[PDB]
Design a protein around this motif. Structure first.
Motif, PDB file in Angstrom:
ATOM      1  N   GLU A 166       0.924  -1.194  -0.016  1.00  0.00           N
ATOM      2  CA  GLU A 166       0.010  -0.133   0.104  1.00  0.00           C
ATOM      3  C   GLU A 166       0.903   1.321   0.032  1.00  0.00           C
ATOM      4  N   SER A 167       0.357   2.374  -0.370  1.00  0.00           N
ATOM      5  CA  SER A 167       1.154   3.498  -0.773  1.00  0.00           C
ATOM      6  C   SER A 167       0.570   4.606   0.024  1.00  0.00           C
ATOM      7  N   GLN A 168       1.462   5.295   0.988  1.00  0.00           N
ATOM      8  CA  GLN A 168       1.247   6.606   1.655  1.00  0.00           C
ATOM      9  C   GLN A 168       0.817   7.514   0.695  1.00  0.00           C
ATOM     10  N   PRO A 169      -0.474   8.338   0.905  1.00  0.00           N
ATOM     11  CA  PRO A 169      -0.803   9.326   0.044  1.00  0.00           C
ATOM     12  C   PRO A 169       0.265  10.392  -0.064  1.00  0.00           C
ATOM     13  N   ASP A 170       0.567  11.020  -1.288  1.00  0.00           N
ATOM     14  CA  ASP A 170       1.482  12.186  -1.449  1.00  0.00           C
ATOM     15  C   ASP A 170       0.946  13.083  -0.768  1.00  0.00           C
ATOM     16  N   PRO A 171       2.170  14.056  -0.193  1.00  0.00           N
ATOM     17  CA  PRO A 171       1.880  15.118   0.615  1.00  0.00           C
ATOM     18  C   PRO A 171       0.825  16.220   0.054  1.00  0.00           C
ATOM     19  N   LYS A 172      -0.101  16.817   1.075  1.00  0.00           N
ATOM     20  CA  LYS A 172      -1.009  17.646   1.045  1.00  0.00           C
ATOM     21  C   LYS A 172      -2.003  17.568   2.048  1.00  0.00           C
ATOM     22  N   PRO A 173      -2.481  16.328   2.446  1.00  0.00           N
ATOM     23  CA  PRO A 173      -2.640  15.975   3.740  1.00  0.00           C
ATOM     24  C   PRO A 173      -1.312  15.981   4.410  1.00  0.00           C
ATOM     25  N   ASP A 174      -1.158  16.657   5.694  1.00  0.00           N
ATOM     26  CA  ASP A 174       0.039  16.906   6.283  1.00  0.00           C
ATOM     27  C   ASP A 174       0.905  17.778   4.954  1.00  0.00           C
ATOM     28  N   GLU A 175       0.629  18.959   4.829  1.00  0.00           N
ATOM     29  CA  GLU A 175       1.414  19.629   3.920  1.00  0.00           C
ATOM     30  C   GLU A 175       2.771  19.865   4.449  1.00  0.00           C
ATOM     31  N   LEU A 176       3.615  20.158   3.510  1.00  0.00           N
ATOM     32  CA  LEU A 176       5.100  19.971   3.735  1.00  0.00           C
ATOM     33  C   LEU A 176       5.529  21.097   4.753  1.00  0.00           C
ATOM     34  N   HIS A 177       6.831  21.047   5.443  1.00  0.00           N
ATOM     35  CA  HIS A 177       7.449  22.001   6.114  1.00  0.00           C
ATOM     36  C   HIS A 177       7.910  23.009   5.259  1.00  0.00           C
ATOM     37  N   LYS A 178       7.751  24.336   5.453  1.00  0.00           N
ATOM     38  CA  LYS A 178       8.611  25.308   4.526  1.00  0.00           C
ATOM     39  C   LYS A 178       9.794  25.795   5.110  1.00  0.00           C
ATOM     40  N   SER A 179      10.915  25.559   4.480  1.00  0.00           N
ATOM     41  CA  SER A 179      11.988  26.249   5.096  1.00  0.00           C
ATOM     42  C   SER A 179      12.105  27.703   5.513  1.00  0.00           C
ATOM     43  N   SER A 180      11.259  28.455   4.800  1.00  0.00           N
ATOM     44  CA  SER A 180      11.241  30.098   4.856  1.00  0.00           C
ATOM     45  C   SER A 180      10.786  30.129   6.216  1.00  0.00           C
ATOM     46  N   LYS A 181       9.971  29.271   6.873  1.00  0.00           N
ATOM     47  CA  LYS A 181       9.262  29.527   8.051  1.00  0.00           C
ATOM     48  C   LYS A 181      10.139  29.046   9.411  1.00  0.00           C
ATOM     49  N   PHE A 182      11.261  28.388   8.961  1.00  0.00           N
ATOM     50  CA  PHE A 182      12.119  28.061   9.999  1.00  0.00           C
ATOM     51  C   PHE A 182      13.264  29.004  10.385  1.00  0.00           C
ATOM     52  N   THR A 183      13.384  29.527  11.345  1.00  0.00           N
ATOM     53  CA  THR A 183      14.064  30.645  11.682  1.00  0.00           C
ATOM     54  C   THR A 183      15.289  30.314  12.671  1.00  0.00           C
ATOM     55  N   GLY A 184      15.435  28.956  12.919  1.00  0.00           N
ATOM     56  CA  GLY A 184      16.738  28.669  13.667  1.00  0.00           C
ATOM     57  C   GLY A 184      17.791  28.520  12.817  1.00  0.00           C
ATOM     58  N   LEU A 185      18.832  27.658  13.426  1.00  0.00           N
ATOM     59  CA  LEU A 185      20.170  27.250  12.855  1.00  0.00           C
ATOM     60  C   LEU A 185      20.129  26.367  11.879  1.00  0.00           C
ATOM     61  N   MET A 186      19.836  26.417  10.363  1.00  0.00           N
ATOM     62  CA  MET A 186      19.774  25.161   9.558  1.00  0.00           C
ATOM     63  C   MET A 186      21.016  24.139   9.795  1.00  0.00           C
ATOM     64  N   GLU A 187      22.378  24.621  10.171  1.00  0.00           N
ATOM     65  CA  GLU A 187      23.285  23.924  10.288  1.00  0.00           C
ATOM     66  C   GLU A 187      22.917  22.816  11.209  1.00  0.00           C
TER      67      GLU A 187
END
Length: 238
Positions: free
Chosen positions: A1-22
């Motif tokens: 069986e296949s997990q539905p592709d993202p849109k339920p659970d939409e994806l994390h957006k890097s622009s909204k992460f403001t911590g240290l990407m390192e």
């Protein structure tokens, strides 16, 4: 069986992460745990195993705690010879060793922690490496494909995810010190008529919890290296 592709659970957006990407980058940089034909030497909690795996390259650890989702997995591998492969963390890592009051001045033990990453050694070895093709989609177009290699018949998804993202960090700057050029990313594993995927970007906000992120690998999920295909879907930042 296949997990539905993202849109339920939409994806994390890097622009909204403001911590240290390192703090995400370092998990998929050069250093990782890799050991071949080793046996557990201790146990902290009932759902982990402890290994003496030395960091021969930099000596940053001498002991590695592997945590699993449940007791059944730790029982399955306890005292057996296994291969270990995975992304490790330090800041949130803690365990104690049960060496029964020990001796020989155990002192100065250097610890690191990880989740899953374990496969039996005997029986699981290929004579020659196997290549797995990764197709990378940027904004829907396949502009780059490359292969990763393993010598295991059954391989953890963690090992393949690490190898995939390592290439992309080095060659496509998937993670940088304080940003990513991509807004969203997911990695999709296809094995016959089954498929599943992981979000590649950190949750929003100003802190990245490495331990909680890596916990997704605690199921020790494996795929057959001869049947699996990998697809990566990235979208570019405005």
């Amino acid at each position: 069986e296949s997990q539905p592709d993202p849109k339920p659970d939409e994806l994390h957006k890097s622009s909204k992460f403001t911590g240290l990407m390192e703090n995400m980058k370092v998990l998929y940089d050069d250093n990782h745990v890799s050991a071949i034909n080793v046996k557990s030497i201790d146990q902290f909690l009932y759902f982990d195993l402890i290994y003496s795996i030395k960091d021969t390259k930099l000596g940053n650890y001498d002991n590695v705690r592997v945590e699993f989702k449940n007791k059944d997995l730790a029982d399955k591998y306890k005292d057996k010879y296994v291969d270990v492969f995975g992304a490790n963390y330090y800041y949130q890592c803690y365990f104690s060793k049960k060496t029964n009051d020990i001796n020989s001045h155990q002192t100065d033990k250097r610890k690191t922690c990880m989740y899953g990453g374990v496969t039996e050694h005997n029986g699981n070895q290929l004579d020659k490496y196997r290549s797995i093709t990764v197709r990378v989609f940027e904004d829907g177009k396949n502009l780059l494909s490359f292969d990763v290699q393993t010598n295991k018949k059954k391989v953890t998804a963690q090992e393949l995810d690490y190898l995939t993202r390592h290439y992309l960090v080095k060659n496509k700057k998937l993670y940088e010190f304080n940003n990513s050029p991509y807004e969203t990313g997911y990695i999709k594993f296809i094995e016959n008529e089954n498929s599943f995927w992981y979000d590649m970007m950190p949750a929003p906000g100003d802190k990245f919890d490495q331990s909680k992120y890596l916990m997704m690998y605690n199921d020790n999920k494996m795929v057959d290296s001869k049947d699996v295909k990998i697809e990566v879907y990235l979208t570019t930042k405005k």
